[PDB]
């Protein structure tokens, strides 16, 4: 008899949900000709489950920040993630041509940290539009973009007519309703930002009008190039807020991760989302995925897909195959198929776990 | 054979530490005449262990905020707490005679939340003085006090000569060094605060000069009485900060909980700290102590001490008796003395835990 920790994502019972990309997007098949499911690491037998929210070409972080949006939506006791690759160093995103992808990688890490920690304690994830009102005549402007990637959260608001510089203070009201909590971005250009001969230090506050909490960021970097848009990801309660800009462009959330239905602490499961080695990926979801709130799973091999080089891999197929059955015990070392006896002690465990005793 | 969850605090191995009050203060015996150890719930056999930091009459929260200070200091993989009672509704603390103890109870809850969560991930706790520099000629002032309790963290700084009201903006620099992280208070009077015919709305920011993060609180309450000094407990990194007051009195930290030596996640154990029923206690440490980071233990009886009514209780003695031996498994339901078989599945477990399987 053998009850080793196995390298899969699974579920204690039927109460689970997976968030993904093309490698688990059952709907993508209609855009394959001929129709072929092999682009998936997910077993298509799960295509009718109602337990997956995945979109080819997308990722939760991508959708959170950019116009290339998919309304990831799902609910489960145990939450599983297999996405992230669709925002990687490969995409070489930077707000401007003189920016830094490293900043965007740092953002990615901070985002998924909040997502993983919070989905250990809420059943439900979706996206909600965040309404805001700005009183001036200036409109939103797409100042952060690169290739086909256009940032739209937070929004930037253009300077008013009548101002000649960026030393102005302006504000907007944004309102959060419909969720227990909300993940929103608070961002600044962190660097010496040149505009018409003057160097700016971006400053942005958000203010909960009723709790009285001020959350702010001011630029502190001295470099005049190779800097970018640094974001923090706030986890906020419902209420009415001001976005108060003290320098450069006013920024205000336009989308939030909507967290609902508080649950008993239940660690999330996260599968490494990377390209075949020929493209540059990152380890930001690995950094984000820590005990006790997250179990991280990865294959021991290069990602070599059979449909194309980046889709349909033996190693990841195997990891996801655990979704085809119930398993009693989840641990840092893996998933145990039996709840009785083992030869290793499950670490940071959840479920009905075996003893490594005599 | 029986392996039930037992209602004790214990330790997997020798690597543990307890923080306490008189009920575990071995040094207090010298102030008993004749010398009598019965005032303790702790077994005096543990008096030579070097694993306890306790002080009669005190509590971590009491020491954090007030002049009645004890430099709680300790290091351990598993941290245990048996204190809190020395700041309870019984003490009826409020900053002023028109204040609210409920505010102070809320503060207490928020404080211990940060302490418990963080001692699940650091080995070492102590207190450090926080140096600050204020540039004006005004001095600190003891504006918050009641009975023998005098608040000294955060400090209040008096108004300068030359100001006739409290609509002024002033600041201080405070510096955090010597720890991986620091718990400090950020507080305001949350209410309409009357001074010489004018009503104030206290405003306080802290600013990390190098990370650029602004942490602020502004008063939002409309009540003109029955309000008090609301505190939030920030967990900050080392660095150089400004305390920027925008209204009422400038407040600045004078003490921090000093957190050191990052460790693998290890839930803390917390024992209910209450008076005999004849005095008013609170459940704030219970609220603070949640899975996965904390196990809460309580007796099923009134606290009836044998030394005096508030010291040396059978129920709490029993809970603490588990410190006299190693135990393999810690769980929400209790401590399991054996790591092999049981009849219940350990929840949120840590250590070598039994199976409830066949
Ligand atoms: C954050 O940045 C803002 C904007 O740069 C700072 O506010 C400005 O501070 C300078 C003083 O250095 C003044 O000249 C401006 O009038 C201020 N603008 C305002 C208030 O709109 C702000 O003080 C910084 N926040 C801190 C340091 O906590
Ligand atoms: C927090 O409170 C402060 C102090 O009351 C606010 O700053 C003052 O705002 C009023 C405008 O209502 C002005 O009359 C004062 O000149 C401001 N004082 C300063 C800047 O020292 C502050 O705006 C509030 N913070 C918010 C709303 O985020
Ligand atoms: C995402 O879908 C959810 C569930 O239908 C809906 O409430 C929410 O408004 C959607 N968010 C969008 C379209 O931004
Ligand atoms: C996943 O495993 C592969 C193959 O061992 C390795 O190259 C890669 O760095 C791992 N990814 C992370 C995020 O650890
Ligand atoms: C991620 O990569 C960095 C190197 O860039 C490394 O120092 C870090 O430990 C890695 N973390 C994980 C969790 O793989
Ligand atoms: C799907 O593509 C895979 C990999 O290219 C290949 O094995 C197979 O020919 C295709 N299957 C069908 C039914 O066309
Ligand atoms: C553990 O469970 C498996 C499957 O039921 C069984 O074959 C094995 O003998 C069991 N071992 C025990 C109870 O020691
Ligand atoms: C508490 O004791 C520790 C350890 O000796 C010391 O570093 C620290 O300064 C003390 N804190 C005080 C006296 O505030
Ligand atoms: C501890 O138990 C006693 C006796 O059952 C009960 O009265 C008390 O409320 C409990 N305290 C907390 C904080 O739950
Ligand atoms: C603490 O007491 C309040 C009533 O004041 C109650 O609503 C709350 O559930 C209690 N919490 C715990 C953890 O005992
Ligand atoms: C200590 O006090 C306890 C409780 O009052 C009592 O049983 C005993 O007389 C005392 N013990 C000694 C050695 O004096
Ligand atoms: C569990 O351990 C206890 C103490 O060693 C022993 O008496 C009992 O029989 C064991 N039961 C098992 C291994 O089933
Ligand atoms: K701004
Ligand atoms: K103040």
PDB file of N, CA and C in Angstrom, chain B residues 82-133:
ATOM      1  N   UNK B  82      -1.424  34.100  27.757  1.00  0.00           N
ATOM      2  CA  UNK B  82      -2.378  34.032  28.872  1.00  0.00           C
ATOM      3  C   UNK B  82      -2.347  35.361  29.616  1.00  0.00           C
ATOM      4  N   UNK B  83      -2.859  36.364  28.941  1.00  0.00           N
ATOM      5  CA  UNK B  83      -2.948  37.712  29.476  1.00  0.00           C
ATOM      6  C   UNK B  83      -4.005  38.502  28.745  1.00  0.00           C
ATOM      7  N   UNK B  84      -4.347  39.635  29.337  1.00  0.00           N
ATOM      8  CA  UNK B  84      -5.337  40.507  28.759  1.00  0.00           C
ATOM      9  C   UNK B  84      -6.250  41.112  29.798  1.00  0.00           C
ATOM     10  N   UNK B  85      -6.444  40.366  30.869  1.00  0.00           N
ATOM     11  CA  UNK B  85      -7.399  40.762  31.929  1.00  0.00           C
ATOM     12  C   UNK B  85      -7.080  42.108  32.543  1.00  0.00           C
ATOM     13  N   UNK B  86      -5.813  42.466  32.538  1.00  0.00           N
ATOM     14  CA  UNK B  86      -5.400  43.752  33.160  1.00  0.00           C
ATOM     15  C   UNK B  86      -5.648  44.980  32.280  1.00  0.00           C
ATOM     16  N   UNK B  87      -6.475  44.754  31.272  1.00  0.00           N
ATOM     17  CA  UNK B  87      -7.200  45.869  30.647  1.00  0.00           C
ATOM     18  C   UNK B  87      -8.527  45.356  30.141  1.00  0.00           C
ATOM     19  N   UNK B  88      -9.530  45.582  30.985  1.00  0.00           N
ATOM     20  CA  UNK B  88     -10.891  45.058  30.812  1.00  0.00           C
ATOM     21  C   UNK B  88     -11.926  46.134  31.119  1.00  0.00           C
ATOM     22  N   UNK B  89     -13.224  45.865  30.869  1.00  0.00           N
ATOM     23  CA  UNK B  89     -14.227  46.894  31.143  1.00  0.00           C
ATOM     24  C   UNK B  89     -14.206  47.326  32.612  1.00  0.00           C
ATOM     25  N   UNK B  90     -13.840  46.376  33.438  1.00  0.00           N
ATOM     26  CA  UNK B  90     -13.657  46.618  34.859  1.00  0.00           C
ATOM     27  C   UNK B  90     -12.841  47.868  35.146  1.00  0.00           C
ATOM     28  N   UNK B  91     -11.817  48.114  34.334  1.00  0.00           N
ATOM     29  CA  UNK B  91     -10.903  49.233  34.600  1.00  0.00           C
ATOM     30  C   UNK B  91     -11.590  50.523  34.227  1.00  0.00           C
ATOM     31  N   UNK B  92     -12.654  50.394  33.449  1.00  0.00           N
ATOM     32  CA  UNK B  92     -13.455  51.547  32.993  1.00  0.00           C
ATOM     33  C   UNK B  92     -12.613  52.663  32.376  1.00  0.00           C
ATOM     34  N   UNK B  93     -11.561  52.282  31.672  1.00  0.00           N
ATOM     35  CA  UNK B  93     -10.754  53.309  31.008  1.00  0.00           C
ATOM     36  C   UNK B  93     -11.467  54.071  29.893  1.00  0.00           C
ATOM     37  N   UNK B  94     -11.273  55.370  29.938  1.00  0.00           N
ATOM     38  CA  UNK B  94     -11.679  56.271  28.861  1.00  0.00           C
ATOM     39  C   UNK B  94     -10.745  57.445  28.935  1.00  0.00           C
ATOM     40  N   UNK B  95     -10.506  58.090  27.809  1.00  0.00           N
ATOM     41  CA  UNK B  95      -9.478  59.151  27.789  1.00  0.00           C
ATOM     42  C   UNK B  95      -9.881  60.315  28.659  1.00  0.00           C
ATOM     43  N   UNK B  96     -11.186  60.501  28.697  1.00  0.00           N
ATOM     44  CA  UNK B  96     -11.809  61.541  29.506  1.00  0.00           C
ATOM     45  C   UNK B  96     -13.100  61.023  30.097  1.00  0.00           C
ATOM     46  N   UNK B  97     -13.667  61.830  30.997  1.00  0.00           N
ATOM     47  CA  UNK B  97     -14.804  61.388  31.800  1.00  0.00           C
ATOM     48  C   UNK B  97     -16.044  61.246  30.944  1.00  0.00           C
ATOM     49  N   UNK B  98     -16.049  61.914  29.796  1.00  0.00           N
ATOM     50  CA  UNK B  98     -17.192  61.817  28.879  1.00  0.00           C
ATOM     51  C   UNK B  98     -16.966  60.796  27.763  1.00  0.00           C
ATOM     52  N   UNK B  99     -15.905  60.003  27.889  1.00  0.00           N
ATOM     53  CA  UNK B  99     -15.507  59.058  26.816  1.00  0.00           C
ATOM     54  C   UNK B  99     -16.272  57.752  26.795  1.00  0.00           C
ATOM     55  N   UNK B 100     -15.669  56.744  26.184  1.00  0.00           N
ATOM     56  CA  UNK B 100     -16.308  55.436  25.971  1.00  0.00           C
ATOM     57  C   UNK B 100     -15.348  54.274  26.119  1.00  0.00           C
ATOM     58  N   UNK B 101     -15.672  53.361  27.025  1.00  0.00           N
ATOM     59  CA  UNK B 101     -14.814  52.198  27.231  1.00  0.00           C
ATOM     60  C   UNK B 101     -14.960  51.251  26.058  1.00  0.00           C
ATOM     61  N   UNK B 102     -16.095  51.363  25.375  1.00  0.00           N
ATOM     62  CA  UNK B 102     -16.381  50.493  24.236  1.00  0.00           C
ATOM     63  C   UNK B 102     -15.359  50.749  23.138  1.00  0.00           C
ATOM     64  N   UNK B 103     -14.961  52.008  22.991  1.00  0.00           N
ATOM     65  CA  UNK B 103     -13.911  52.385  22.039  1.00  0.00           C
ATOM     66  C   UNK B 103     -12.592  51.672  22.406  1.00  0.00           C
ATOM     67  N   UNK B 104     -12.331  51.618  23.705  1.00  0.00           N
ATOM     68  CA  UNK B 104     -11.080  51.048  24.222  1.00  0.00           C
ATOM     69  C   UNK B 104     -11.094  49.530  24.102  1.00  0.00           C
ATOM     70  N   UNK B 105     -12.287  48.957  24.185  1.00  0.00           N
ATOM     71  CA  UNK B 105     -12.454  47.513  23.949  1.00  0.00           C
ATOM     72  C   UNK B 105     -12.223  47.168  22.463  1.00  0.00           C
ATOM     73  N   UNK B 106     -12.676  48.067  21.606  1.00  0.00           N
ATOM     74  CA  UNK B 106     -12.500  47.888  20.169  1.00  0.00           C
ATOM     75  C   UNK B 106     -11.006  47.949  19.832  1.00  0.00           C
ATOM     76  N   UNK B 107     -10.328  48.896  20.445  1.00  0.00           N
ATOM     77  CA  UNK B 107      -8.870  49.038  20.313  1.00  0.00           C
ATOM     78  C   UNK B 107      -8.144  47.780  20.731  1.00  0.00           C
ATOM     79  N   UNK B 108      -8.549  47.292  21.874  1.00  0.00           N
ATOM     80  CA  UNK B 108      -7.966  46.060  22.424  1.00  0.00           C
ATOM     81  C   UNK B 108      -8.097  44.910  21.452  1.00  0.00           C
ATOM     82  N   UNK B 109      -9.252  44.774  20.847  1.00  0.00           N
ATOM     83  CA  UNK B 109      -9.464  43.708  19.867  1.00  0.00           C
ATOM     84  C   UNK B 109      -8.568  43.828  18.652  1.00  0.00           C
ATOM     85  N   UNK B 110      -8.491  45.040  18.121  1.00  0.00           N
ATOM     86  CA  UNK B 110      -7.663  45.303  16.956  1.00  0.00           C
ATOM     87  C   UNK B 110      -6.164  45.071  17.224  1.00  0.00           C
ATOM     88  N   UNK B 111      -5.718  45.441  18.414  1.00  0.00           N
ATOM     89  CA  UNK B 111      -4.324  45.255  18.820  1.00  0.00           C
ATOM     90  C   UNK B 111      -3.947  43.789  18.830  1.00  0.00           C
ATOM     91  N   UNK B 112      -4.715  43.009  19.589  1.00  0.00           N
ATOM     92  CA  UNK B 112      -4.358  41.596  19.795  1.00  0.00           C
ATOM     93  C   UNK B 112      -4.471  40.812  18.473  1.00  0.00           C
ATOM     94  N   UNK B 113      -5.351  41.287  17.592  1.00  0.00           N
ATOM     95  CA  UNK B 113      -5.465  40.691  16.248  1.00  0.00           C
ATOM     96  C   UNK B 113      -4.140  40.741  15.562  1.00  0.00           C
ATOM     97  N   UNK B 114      -3.471  41.896  15.621  1.00  0.00           N
ATOM     98  CA  UNK B 114      -2.181  42.059  14.935  1.00  0.00           C
ATOM     99  C   UNK B 114      -1.092  41.227  15.647  1.00  0.00           C
ATOM    100  N   UNK B 115      -1.203  41.191  16.967  1.00  0.00           N
ATOM    101  CA  UNK B 115      -0.192  40.472  17.754  1.00  0.00           C
ATOM    102  C   UNK B 115      -0.280  38.997  17.463  1.00  0.00           C
ATOM    103  N   UNK B 116      -1.493  38.461  17.398  1.00  0.00           N
ATOM    104  CA  UNK B 116      -1.655  37.006  17.248  1.00  0.00           C
ATOM    105  C   UNK B 116      -1.244  36.577  15.838  1.00  0.00           C
ATOM    106  N   UNK B 117      -1.660  37.366  14.851  1.00  0.00           N
ATOM    107  CA  UNK B 117      -1.415  37.033  13.455  1.00  0.00           C
ATOM    108  C   UNK B 117       0.074  37.065  13.198  1.00  0.00           C
ATOM    109  N   UNK B 118       0.724  38.047  13.798  1.00  0.00           N
ATOM    110  CA  UNK B 118       2.144  38.215  13.524  1.00  0.00           C
ATOM    111  C   UNK B 118       3.036  37.240  14.305  1.00  0.00           C
ATOM    112  N   UNK B 119       2.597  36.839  15.493  1.00  0.00           N
ATOM    113  CA  UNK B 119       3.407  35.861  16.262  1.00  0.00           C
ATOM    114  C   UNK B 119       3.227  34.433  15.731  1.00  0.00           C
ATOM    115  N   UNK B 120       2.377  34.283  14.717  1.00  0.00           N
ATOM    116  CA  UNK B 120       2.269  33.010  13.950  1.00  0.00           C
ATOM    117  C   UNK B 120       3.380  32.931  12.939  1.00  0.00           C
ATOM    118  N   UNK B 121       4.026  34.065  12.669  1.00  0.00           N
ATOM    119  CA  UNK B 121       5.072  34.157  11.651  1.00  0.00           C
ATOM    120  C   UNK B 121       6.415  34.784  12.045  1.00  0.00           C
ATOM    121  N   UNK B 122       6.527  35.241  13.280  1.00  0.00           N
ATOM    122  CA  UNK B 122       7.818  35.650  13.895  1.00  0.00           C
ATOM    123  C   UNK B 122       8.056  34.891  15.192  1.00  0.00           C
ATOM    124  N   UNK B 123       9.323  34.589  15.470  1.00  0.00           N
ATOM    125  CA  UNK B 123       9.717  33.872  16.691  1.00  0.00           C
ATOM    126  C   UNK B 123       9.717  34.793  17.897  1.00  0.00           C
ATOM    127  N   UNK B 124      10.134  36.034  17.662  1.00  0.00           N
ATOM    128  CA  UNK B 124      10.494  36.976  18.727  1.00  0.00           C
ATOM    129  C   UNK B 124       9.596  38.166  18.872  1.00  0.00           C
ATOM    130  N   UNK B 125       9.182  38.398  20.104  1.00  0.00           N
ATOM    131  CA  UNK B 125       8.479  39.596  20.507  1.00  0.00           C
ATOM    132  C   UNK B 125       9.204  40.303  21.648  1.00  0.00           C
ATOM    133  N   UNK B 126       9.346  41.623  21.484  1.00  0.00           N
ATOM    134  CA  UNK B 126       9.687  42.539  22.570  1.00  0.00           C
ATOM    135  C   UNK B 126       9.107  43.905  22.255  1.00  0.00           C
ATOM    136  N   UNK B 127       9.353  44.851  23.162  1.00  0.00           N
ATOM    137  CA  UNK B 127       9.004  46.255  22.996  1.00  0.00           C
ATOM    138  C   UNK B 127      10.256  47.058  22.702  1.00  0.00           C
ATOM    139  N   UNK B 128      10.092  48.070  21.860  1.00  0.00           N
ATOM    140  CA  UNK B 128      11.151  49.030  21.595  1.00  0.00           C
ATOM    141  C   UNK B 128      10.612  50.426  21.724  1.00  0.00           C
ATOM    142  N   UNK B 129      11.455  51.317  22.229  1.00  0.00           N
ATOM    143  CA  UNK B 129      11.099  52.725  22.282  1.00  0.00           C
ATOM    144  C   UNK B 129      11.169  53.203  20.840  1.00  0.00           C
ATOM    145  N   UNK B 130      10.250  54.077  20.491  1.00  0.00           N
ATOM    146  CA  UNK B 130      10.325  54.678  19.180  1.00  0.00           C
ATOM    147  C   UNK B 130      10.810  56.122  19.334  1.00  0.00           C
ATOM    148  N   UNK B 131      12.025  56.399  18.887  1.00  0.00           N
ATOM    149  CA  UNK B 131      12.428  57.805  18.968  1.00  0.00           C
ATOM    150  C   UNK B 131      11.728  58.702  17.978  1.00  0.00           C
ATOM    151  N   UNK B 132      11.345  59.867  18.458  1.00  0.00           N
ATOM    152  CA  UNK B 132      10.840  60.907  17.582  1.00  0.00           C
ATOM    153  C   UNK B 132      11.471  62.274  17.875  1.00  0.00           C
ATOM    154  N   UNK B 133      11.419  63.126  16.856  1.00  0.00           N
ATOM    155  CA  UNK B 133      11.823  64.530  16.967  1.00  0.00           C
ATOM    156  C   UNK B 133      10.699  65.427  16.490  1.00  0.00           C
TER     157      UNK B 133
END
